[PDB]
Amino acid sequence: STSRGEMSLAEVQCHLDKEGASNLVIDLIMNASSDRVFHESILLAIALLEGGNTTIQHSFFCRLTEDKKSEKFFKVFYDRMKVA
Amino acid sequence: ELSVLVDVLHRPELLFPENTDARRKCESGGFICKLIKHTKQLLEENEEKLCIKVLQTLREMMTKDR
Amino acid sequence: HMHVDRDPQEQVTPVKYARLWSEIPSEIAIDDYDSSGASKDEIKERFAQTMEFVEEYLRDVVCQRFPFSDKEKNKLTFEVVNLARNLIYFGFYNFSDLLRLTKILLAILDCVHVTTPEKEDIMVMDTKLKIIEILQFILN
């Protein structure tokens, strides 16, 4: 028929989640060295999580729980807020 | 032009001939997976502009009126 | 290594900025900006046969159905494309010639597309990486 990729916002977010864009953004935040990279990672995560997608929140929680490296992930936010 | 690039990234499997190996690989969504996998290790070699462009395009993939 | 990497040949930039405004730059047709080489031709004519040999060899590789199947021909292809890259970056090619070579390389890759665990040859990937510098130079 029309052969149109309707791809509503929720299914687009879940689709990009399956490949692991969540891991991409969390790792970019983890090993960020420039302000612009961290800012773009934050914006990407905001756009990805918009709408309260439960799958993406579950993926974040699962990786943060299974990964022992999350201490620097929280430190990156803590020191940014402290500097502010 | 940026919108054209994003639209291509939604469905890049159409650019290949049907029933070929490239097209079966791309039809399964492996292109975006490979792209993000390369982007993951990309930050070490100090390519800030290229990683920024990749992230901005991935973010703009989440927009309406496409 | 004997002739190409020798004096007085040296690297040339493809994008210029200190363009003197008082100069001509007339309508200059379309594909004749890369001209007025009154001094480069004296070096050019002796490698003219080499360059046309490179072009005809790449066209022959285009004619071959599978360009990256023979292991022993891969060495010749790799060093030929390396020589072509070094010739280009030293300023030995014109604009139309660069377009012809670009079409040849794209035809090679398109034939590879038509052809399309599995430990591919590392030097095949090296050959594929080699032409990317040529593409960057022609875009500039």
Q: Which two tokens stand for residue C91?
A: 């300023």
Q: Is any Cβ of chain B less than 8 angstroms from the Cβ of A9? A: yes
Residues of B with CB below 8 A from C116's CB?
20-22
Q: Is any Cβ of chain A less than 8 angstroms from the Cβ of B8? A: no
Chain centroid, CA C25 distance in Å: 27
Residues of B with CB below 8 A from A23's CB?
40
By CB atoms closer than 10 A (0-12, 13-18, 19+), residue C77 is buried
Subunit partners of chain B (3 or more CB pairs within 8 A): A, C
CA atoms of C74 and C95, how far apart (whole Å): 28
Instruction: Give the list of residues 6+ apart from residue C58 with CB closer than 8 angstroms, or none.
Output: C80, C81, C84, C101, C104, C105, C108
- Amino acid of residue C7: D
**Structure determined by:** cryo-EM
Mutation target for C interface from B13, B18, B19, B20: give the one with most C CBs within 10 A: B20
Q: Would you say C98 and C88 are in contact if contact means Cβ atoms under 8 Å apart? A: yes
CA atoms of C16 and B20, how far apart (whole Å): 44
Number of H helices, E strands in chain A: 5, 0
Residues of A with CB below 8 A from B64's CB?
9
- Amino acid of residue C48: A
Q: Would you say C1 and C79 are in contact if contact means Cβ atoms under 8 Å apart? A: no
* Main-chain dihedrals φ then ψ at residue C87, nearest 5 degrees: -60, -45
